[PDB]
Amino acid sequence: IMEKFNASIAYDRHLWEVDVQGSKAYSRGLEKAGLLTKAEMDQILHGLDKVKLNSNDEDIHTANERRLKELIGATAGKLHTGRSRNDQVVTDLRLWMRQTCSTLSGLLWELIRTMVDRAEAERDVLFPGYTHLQRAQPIRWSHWILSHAVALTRDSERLLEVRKRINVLPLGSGAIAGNPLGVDRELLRAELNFGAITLNSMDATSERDFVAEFLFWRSLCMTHLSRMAEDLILYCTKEFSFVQLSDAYSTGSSLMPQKKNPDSLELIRSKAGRVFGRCAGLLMTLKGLPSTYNKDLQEDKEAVFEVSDTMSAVLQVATGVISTLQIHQENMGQALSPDMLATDLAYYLVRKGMPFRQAHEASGKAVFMAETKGVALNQLSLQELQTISPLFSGDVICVWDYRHSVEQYGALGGTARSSVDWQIRQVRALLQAQ
Amino acid sequence: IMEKFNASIAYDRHLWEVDVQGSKAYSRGLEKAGLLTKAEMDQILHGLDKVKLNSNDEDIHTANERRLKELIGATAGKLHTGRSRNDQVVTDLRLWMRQTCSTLSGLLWELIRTMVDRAEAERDVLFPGYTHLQRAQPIRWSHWILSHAVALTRDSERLLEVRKRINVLPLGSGAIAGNPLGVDRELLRAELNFGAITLNSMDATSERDFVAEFLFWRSLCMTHLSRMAEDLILYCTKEFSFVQLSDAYSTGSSLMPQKKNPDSLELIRSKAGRVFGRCAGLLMTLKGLPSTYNKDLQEDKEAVFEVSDTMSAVLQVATGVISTLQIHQENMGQALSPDMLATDLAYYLVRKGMPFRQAHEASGKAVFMAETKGVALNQLSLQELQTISPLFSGDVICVWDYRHSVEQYGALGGTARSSVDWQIRQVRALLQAQ
Amino acid sequence: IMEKFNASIAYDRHLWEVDVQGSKAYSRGLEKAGLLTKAEMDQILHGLDKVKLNSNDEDIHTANERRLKELIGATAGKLHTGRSRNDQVVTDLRLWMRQTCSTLSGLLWELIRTMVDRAEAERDVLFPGYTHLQRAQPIRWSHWILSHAVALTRDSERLLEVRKRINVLPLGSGAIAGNPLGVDRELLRAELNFGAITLNSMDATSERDFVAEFLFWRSLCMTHLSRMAEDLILYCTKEFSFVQLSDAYSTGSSLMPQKKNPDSLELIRSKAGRVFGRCAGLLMTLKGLPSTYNKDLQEDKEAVFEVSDTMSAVLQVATGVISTLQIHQENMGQALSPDMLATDLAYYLVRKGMPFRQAHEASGKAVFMAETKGVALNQLSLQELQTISPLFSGDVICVWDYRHSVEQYGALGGTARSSVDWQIRQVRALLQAQ
Amino acid sequence: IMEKFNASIAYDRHLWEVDVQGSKAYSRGLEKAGLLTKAEMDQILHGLDKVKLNSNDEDIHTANERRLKELIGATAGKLHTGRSRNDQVVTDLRLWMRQTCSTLSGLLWELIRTMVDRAEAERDVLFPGYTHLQRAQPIRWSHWILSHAVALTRDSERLLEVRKRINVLPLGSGAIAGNPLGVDRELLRAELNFGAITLNSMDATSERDFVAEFLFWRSLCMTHLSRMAEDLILYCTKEFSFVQLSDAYSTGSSLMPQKKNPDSLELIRSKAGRVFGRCAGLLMTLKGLPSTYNKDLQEDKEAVFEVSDTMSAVLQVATGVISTLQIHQENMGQALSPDMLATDLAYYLVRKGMPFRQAHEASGKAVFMAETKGVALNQLSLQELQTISPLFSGDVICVWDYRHSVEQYGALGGTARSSVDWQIRQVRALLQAQ
């Protein structure tokens, strides 16, 4: 069971197109040191672009040389001098990840692109804003769509910051101390197209902060998307009926088709901890490992392989739900109430030159009046409001306009059409410098 | 119990000097909007620099206005129009944290400063390098000291990156939608000395990514320091006896003083998960919270308050152990062995124009020879090595020099004096651009 | 900072009434071995029932002997022979916990008692049952109240199982190997009223599984209560309006009192991860500690001290919400719909001797018929249903009774009045054997 | 991607032999209700023991009926009336797990059996006991072997306790409320050989405490085995050289075979968090799921499938390392020192009628004397000790016997041969009542 425990091939199959490319460079490195002749350098170089399985192999690194060694045979044995598994593999992984995050950053970018573009489009819809899940203030639909953009926007700032910490080159760090044969790291950083070489042989080998940061990230992006899905499956309630799901991104409901059953917005929510799970593990796996490269570290692979395949895929379903998303407008506009407008009478007298406690006591007196009058806030008489405060005049009429209350929240970052337009710029622009 | 559950004062006492400063600005904001008169603006402004307890208060925000309201009384009621608890508090927290990370980044900087400076100083000491905890290669002491620098160096890059994400200004985001009275956010970002204002009212209110990133960070810095301490308490073993602890940073050992008992390097290791614990929680606490500002979020405080007080303090003990640290040199130099030098005979013939498998088979033949000769590698005759390979000549003598083997690992990032010197520059410089 | 890091008194104040009691026994132990004379045994025994602070002390164990040593002075020095801090403290903790779990098991018992009793009382209320948060089947209110009982019932089985694993006596395990002076463990297990003594000196000292299990438990009970609160704050939605919160267990809502704002059912949900946090830590804190009693372990205290004070308190607020809980019955009964009854026409023909696919295709044909007839399921004509299937007869009338559909789910464990009554017995009884 | 997200077959292949068996019973259930005729009951019964793949299927439940439906065709459609996926699957999982824990409890039992038996065998070996990783007291080797038994013994008490909570029968709980057709649960609990039926339809469906407890368990057993491996890889240090690994359970070391390189005892340590990871996730995945059976819950499978395959396998390698384990006795006996015996002179005068502080001050005076005499504790003259205390006499000679000091720790649970023999009984017996 042990060797079938040491066995890395099942999960690490993916490093093929990375194992050959990382070698072709180190091939070019040794010859520059004069360890290989052009003629033989060009021998194992082609093989690694001339390159079934076998039971005796442990890892993908094996699978290759074990193959390389037939077609070439001679040169093959030497190809791998000075560069051990431990430095070979981190090169084999920084490389895959750095390609996979380029991908990851693009998918996430479309999600933010898809939301911001839609926000512009649905800008004028009204619906309610909740606090402790209870109707509090009329606020715009794009203002909701936008808070999931801005927050998803941060994730790509993060993932762009990690993109650069992954781009380091460790190759040539040997096993504990560096490369004995002297081969220059610089050539290895140019060919592999990485940002720069690493300034220490024991860290490049024993450290996996690059995967740790990536899992911190993922677990945070999901915390973000599991909230987007908590909001949506709640807005998708027969009770609420704000948004209706696409019958392609929705589960089969029969004999009672009124039950437009979610699922996509549930699978997105489950992953929150399945992604966090691996991070919660990868950090404990290395809680206090003594020295340079312990075997413990074989966990780096399976983990970034699962969390990245969950992420690249989920983000696509998330964009796939926001764009299809069909909203029931009337339902949303009928979801408002003058009870939320009560706080707005306080803001009126404030502009007419009155203090707040007082201003909001008049609102309180306006509530109690309709209560006992029985007929609500819209049903209140002008002279009546002139009783509560003479400051009250003809312009109280406009305070009963839900969209007026919304265009009352200005000053950059508010929910006025003006401010939503400003946000739709800032995110798009933020993305433009990404 | 509930209100004594709602009660925030016990832990949130610290926000005093932050609650008064965040107000003095918002005081200057409202008047600019014309909500306060200079004369009254200057009334509540002084009070908030003119400013015992009381049982009826819930939070530190209360404690202040409840105090402000006597001395001023009049103006006091209005002071707090438009800015609710939810936007008041995140301002009250971004602010504290941003001062505490300035602090945090300085402490961590000295730790890296203290190690790099020492590395330069002890550069020439030799000791062994372990793999799966077993003697593998002679490598320098500063080369160990340096791998904990480079790695701690990354943490300050992170913490500097968070330092900027915390520096955002949310004030003026009202409750769900923005500020109704229009007060300009810009003035609020200038006075509070923050980088810029936030581009959304619902995110500034419901989001705590700023504390989430900080806990991700801390848990990673400890993973780093709990390893430094795993290495040190192991090097501090009577069995190993590489380093001897300061009897100030070491625990009382009696009747057998030979037992120089560690503790500081144990308290540093325990925290790994006590720091990770809060992060593991803070992310679950908000696994999928429906909408804008739920009460759930009251967890943001106690958590960054504990993790930051653990971090600022531990880092000082860590610098406090590295600088005092007294090493038993002889013990370390006697900790080497020609068995580790066996792999170096393979690298000799390689330079004399021989292939590796062959070169390392000759080493293998050299091992077996001393084995059966009984007398080890240093005890091997020249013509004997001329038997294993005629390439072997007078210069085999120098291969038995531990420091020669170490100066064999060059090419940037290795453990040669040359490379350690290069690293001592790069970190110091990295820090110079921080 | 270090000693003010070693300092245990701030959090470990609570062990007073446990430190004196654990000693009085070990006093009785040593004399039985003949290490103390009755006369002097009775000297330090009284002191420890005759027993301000001081800065030079580290722990609560200190605080006591340092006090004991004045009043007695002589005998005092010897009192503590053979029993070191490491075995003294685990005794000091098994003891506190075992009293605190007795407490914990009682609070949780009342919560289950309070729910089951209420279930009996509100048995006949109808409301809907949701799947992916969408109206699916009419089911009883006590059937909801009962699923949180049964599940909370398991937690007390767990906590009762841990109650016994905590009840082990470690005292007398010295430091690494046992007690050198021979004092019998048996007497120490009788006096301290524990279940039995521990069969190993190195485990009793280094192991904290007793707190680890307790935190596993807590984190699971909250997962349970954070769900009860997710259900309730959702049922408390102005949109849903199933249950209305007590204005004592509810937060202040003004100018729009229609917004009966939750909080208690939010504080209960936040803790989910604040409780899980400590568990997520306590397990990482000891991920692979080498040998017998490392200092790392000082984490055992602060953690079970926070998680237990959160638990004993939350459970009271949870019982405090279920009992006050006021429900809007009409709202709940009007929350049903014949669309959910469609699946019940399939179960009718099934009893009249028809196969399901067919039976449920007739229901499907009945849906489409009302759809196109425009007039819903209750509005369907008898001969009409005799068209879809002649099996349909006069008894179709009763299928439109929501409570008939509910009394259709029998066979132990269903939601028929009969089954709810059966459950109200089983839980109560389960508790009776606890 | 969504459906290839909904797809369960890849991981859930294993439930075959469980899906057919759970049906054959429910087949026998419906007929007893009179829903199936013996003749047709015996039709789908054989098929489900008469029972390639297909792309249109989602789960293993599908794969079967989709197959069942050809060979039988007729009866097949009805086979699945009243029992939906949600209750079908938990039956499909309680069942697999309950078989897999029987297995799990046996493997773990052999590990405890293998250690206890060996302890008896190596009983007389001496080696040192460490505290903060520093030589403190001479203690027996079986006394180490035994502390990992007692602690592993608890895990099987746990796993035996979960074994019973898994043994519950949910089948017949329909979807939200129970079985509509009335089929008796009792028959379903007898045929499936489970302990009893569940007393609630909404809990059996939405709850996964059974997997949650199993992951709590696993993560704890590994915390235990990752410590056993931390101890062993440290005892396996060339520096320590207490135990030598089997060259079958050890990694290839060349050119320096003195480096007997561990691995098995590293793979065991890595899993600590890979096991904890899933638990840390599975609990967050359900942090506060609203109602009866949300789709979120599809996580129950992949998780208990990975954690159980890691556990059943690791435990075998752990038994596989303890039994092969070859110890270097001389090395261990030479690992002792009279410095550890210093504390034993204090225990001598104590028996000769002297108080401790005094007794241990004489030891202190004995240390200082040898220090300044230069010649250590064994080199101390009788009249010399008669100078420090006249109580000192001829029997001081035996205090310099390491095994005497070990046989000084009696009173049940100590490290005297007498006590180790007592422990070897208690564990074996504990296992006998398991």
Side-chain angles (χ1 to χ4, degrees), chain D residues 29-66 68-82 84-85:
Chain D
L30 290 170
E31 88 102 33
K32 201 217 83 289
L35 277 295
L36 295 161
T37 81
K38 284 281 277 79
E40 69 187 337
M41 187 273 282
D42 307 315
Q43 252 283 90
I44 40 184
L45 213 93
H46 174 233
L48 288 159
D49 57 69
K50 188 73 130 180
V51 174
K52 300 180 180 180
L53 254 308
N54 185 358
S55 50
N56 49 252
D57 317 294
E58 196 218 279
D59 31 316
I60 182 66
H61 301 239
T62 330
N64 282 296
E65 268 99 61
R66 193 251 319 154
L68 191 272
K69 204 173 188 164
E70 141 69 71
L71 33 110
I72 307 306
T75 331
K78 191 71 172 293
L79 143 88
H80 28 165
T81 313
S84 43
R85 277 309 96 88

Side-chain angles (χ1 to χ4, degrees), chain C residues 309-327:
Chain C
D309 198 66
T310 302
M311 286 302 298
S312 78
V314 167
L315 282 178
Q316 299 189 120
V317 172
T319 309
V321 160
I322 286 299
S323 48
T324 51
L325 204 58
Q326 189 236 131
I327 43 168

Side-chain angles (χ1 to χ4, degrees), chain B residues 350-370:
Chain B
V350 149
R351 298 156 190 188
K352 296 279 151 299
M354 185 196 210
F356 193 57
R357 298 164 302 211
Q358 272 185 234
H360 131 296
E361 219 287 65
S363 271
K365 288 196 233 56
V367 164
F368 175 43
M369 186 190 259

Side-chain angles (χ1 to χ4, degrees), chain A residues 77 130 143 154 158 178 185 199-201 203 213 216 224 226 231 287 290-291 357 408-409 411-412 423, chain B residues 77 130 143 154 158 178 180 185 199-201 203 209 213 216 224 226 231 287 290-291 357 409 412 423:
Chain A
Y130 306 85
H143 199 266
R154 222 185 309 269
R158 294 181 173 93
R185 309 269 310 264
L199 28 142
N200 192 289
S201 46
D203 202 50
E213 294 174 299
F216 273 156
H224 282 139
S226 59
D231 247 330
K287 175 230 158 77
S291 80
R357 297 164 303 212
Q408 169 183 256
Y409 285 79
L412 309 324
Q423 290 175 237
Chain B
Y130 306 85
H143 199 267
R154 222 185 308 269
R158 294 181 173 93
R185 308 269 310 264
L199 29 141
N200 192 289
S201 46
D203 203 50
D209 298 327
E213 294 174 299
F216 273 156
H224 282 139
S226 59
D231 248 330
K287 174 230 159 78
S291 80
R357 298 164 302 211
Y409 285 80
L412 310 324
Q423 290 176 237

Side-chain angles (χ1 to χ4, degrees), chain A residues 32-66 68-82 84-217 219-330:
Chain A
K32 201 217 83 289
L35 277 295
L36 295 161
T37 81
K38 284 281 277 79
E40 69 187 337
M41 187 273 282
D42 307 315
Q43 252 283 90
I44 40 184
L45 213 93
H46 174 233
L48 288 159
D49 57 69
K50 188 73 130 180
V51 174
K52 300 180 180 180
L53 254 308
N54 185 358
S55 50
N56 49 252
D57 317 294
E58 196 218 279
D59 31 316
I60 182 66
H61 301 239
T62 330
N64 282 296
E65 268 99 61
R66 193 251 319 154
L68 191 271
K69 204 173 188 164
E70 141 69 71
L71 33 110
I72 307 306
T75 331
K78 191 71 172 293
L79 143 88
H80 28 165
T81 313
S84 43
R85 277 309 96 88
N86 31 260
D87 61 333
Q88 199 172 91
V89 194
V90 185
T91 309
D92 254 56
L93 190 64
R94 294 266 195 181
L95 261 172
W96 160 258
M97 274 176 70
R98 146 245 220 205
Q99 157 248 301
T100 338
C101 291
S102 196
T103 321
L104 248 309
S105 204
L107 292 178
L108 182 58
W109 275 349
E110 256 324 277
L111 211 187
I112 313 156
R113 221 238 51 203
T114 275
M115 292 153 123
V116 173
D117 283 44
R118 188 181 154 91
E120 193 185 62
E122 279 160 336
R123 204 158 62 217
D124 300 296
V125 182
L126 293 184
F127 92 114
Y130 306 85
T131 352
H132 305 221
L133 269 192
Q134 234 155 126
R135 272 189 186 87
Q137 253 168 80
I139 50 160
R140 287 154 125 83
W141 159 261
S142 301
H143 199 266
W144 173 71
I145 291 288
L146 229 24
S147 61
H148 283 140
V150 179
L152 271 182
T153 240
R154 222 185 309 269
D155 295 301
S156 189
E157 198 183 320
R158 294 181 173 93
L159 192 54
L160 257 184
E161 228 90 88
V162 79
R163 190 108 82 97
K164 285 137 63 187
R165 220 111 75 212
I166 295 166
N167 231 323
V168 190
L169 188 276
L171 198 49
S173 283
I176 264 55
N179 218 318
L181 307 185
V183 25
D184 78 315
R185 309 269 310 264
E186 256 307 316
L187 199 70
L188 280 5
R189 66 130 283 237
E191 201 123 276
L192 291 167
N193 285 276
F194 277 136
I197 52 159
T198 189
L199 28 142
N200 192 289
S201 46
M202 283 155 77
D203 202 50
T205 317
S206 242
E207 141 283 0
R208 300 299 182 269
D209 298 327
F210 66 102
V211 290
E213 294 174 299
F214 184 66
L215 304 199
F216 273 156
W217 163 80
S219 43
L220 191 54
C221 184
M222 285 281 107
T223 285
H224 282 139
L225 290 187
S226 59
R227 170 186 254 254
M228 192 188 74
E230 175 80 48
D231 247 330
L232 250 1
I233 61 144
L234 219 113
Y235 289 159
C236 217
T237 302
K238 205 186 285 174
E239 274 70 12
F240 264 56
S241 197
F242 284 174
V243 299
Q244 297 160 248
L245 264 159
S246 182
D247 279 304
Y249 281 93
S250 215
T251 281
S253 179
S254 293
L255 309 198
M256 49 167 146
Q258 295 300 77
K259 237 192 61 189
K260 295 188 70 183
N261 209 266
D263 217 63
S264 318
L265 287 154
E266 278 189 308
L267 100 76
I268 297 175
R269 185 175 54 174
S270 63
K271 304 299 186 182
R274 199 188 162 72
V275 180
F276 167 59
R278 221 51 54 90
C279 186
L282 194 274
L283 225 90
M284 193 189 145
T285 304
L286 34 272
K287 175 230 158 77
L289 299 177
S291 80
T292 318
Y293 187 71
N294 297 266
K295 196 86 178 189
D296 286 60
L297 301 59
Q298 288 282 88
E299 229 88 289
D300 56 333
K301 281 158 267 74
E302 288 178 298
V304 69
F305 273 132
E306 206 193 287
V307 174
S308 69
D309 198 66
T310 302
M311 286 303 298
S312 78
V314 167
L315 282 178
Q316 298 189 120
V317 171
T319 309
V321 160
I322 287 299
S323 47
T324 51
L325 204 58
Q326 190 236 131
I327 43 168
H328 228 4
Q329 293 152 291
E330 311 130 82

Side-chain angles (χ1 to χ4, degrees), chain A residues 293-428:
Chain A
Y293 187 71
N294 297 266
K295 196 86 178 189
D296 286 60
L297 301 59
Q298 288 282 88
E299 229 88 289
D300 56 333
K301 281 158 267 74
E302 288 178 298
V304 69
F305 273 132
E306 206 193 287
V307 174
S308 69
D309 198 66
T310 302
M311 286 303 298
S312 78
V314 167
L315 282 178
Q316 298 189 120
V317 171
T319 309
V321 160
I322 287 299
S323 47
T324 51
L325 204 58
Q326 190 236 131
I327 43 168
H328 228 4
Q329 293 152 291
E330 311 130 82
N331 310 56
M332 306 182 113
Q334 259 71 57
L336 282 334
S337 41
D339 81 306
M340 317 141 144
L341 297 179
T343 67
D344 295 323
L345 282 73
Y347 302 124
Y348 180 103
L349 304 168
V350 149
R351 298 156 190 189
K352 296 280 151 298
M354 185 195 210
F356 193 56
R357 297 164 303 212
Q358 271 185 234
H360 131 295
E361 220 287 65
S363 271
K365 288 196 234 56
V367 164
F368 175 43
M369 187 189 257
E371 231 233 309
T372 307
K373 203 163 98 85
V375 289
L377 287 139
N378 330 67
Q379 306 112 282
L380 289 171
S381 293
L382 268 291
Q383 301 100 300
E384 272 184 39
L385 281 154
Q386 263 115 74
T387 313
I388 305 168
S389 185
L391 296 176
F392 278 116
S393 24
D395 39 329
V396 295
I397 308 303
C398 57
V399 194
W400 314 131
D401 185 86
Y402 299 102
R403 244 195 85 180
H404 161 273
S405 294
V406 314
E407 297 293 316
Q408 169 183 256
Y409 285 79
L412 309 324
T415 306
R417 199 177 196 289
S418 350
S419 295
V420 190
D421 268 297
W422 174 66
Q423 290 175 237
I424 292 169
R425 292 200 225 94
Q426 306 290 162
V427 175
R428 212 118 75 186

Side-chain angles (χ1 to χ4, degrees), chain C residues 77 130 143 154 158 178 180 185 199-201 203 209 213 216 224 226 231 287 290-291 357 409 412 423, chain D residues 77 130 143 154 158 178 185 199-201 203 213 216 224 226 231 287 290-291 357 408-409 411-412 423:
Chain C
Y130 306 85
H143 199 267
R154 222 185 308 269
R158 294 181 173 93
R185 308 269 310 264
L199 29 141
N200 192 290
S201 46
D203 203 50
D209 298 327
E213 294 174 299
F216 273 156
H224 282 139
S226 59
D231 248 330
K287 174 230 159 78
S291 80
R357 298 164 302 211
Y409 285 80
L412 310 324
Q423 290 176 237
Chain D
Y130 306 85
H143 199 266
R154 222 185 309 269
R158 294 181 173 93
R185 309 269 310 264
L199 28 142
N200 192 289
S201 46
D203 202 50
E213 294 174 299
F216 273 156
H224 282 139
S226 59
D231 247 330
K287 175 230 158 77
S291 80
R357 297 164 303 212
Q408 169 183 256
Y409 285 79
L412 309 324
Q423 290 175 237

Side-chain angles (χ1 to χ4, degrees), chain B residues 317-336:
Chain B
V317 172
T319 309
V321 160
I322 286 299
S323 48
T324 51
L325 204 59
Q326 189 236 131
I327 43 168
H328 229 4
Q329 293 152 291
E330 311 130 82
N331 311 56
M332 307 181 113
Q334 260 70 58
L336 283 333

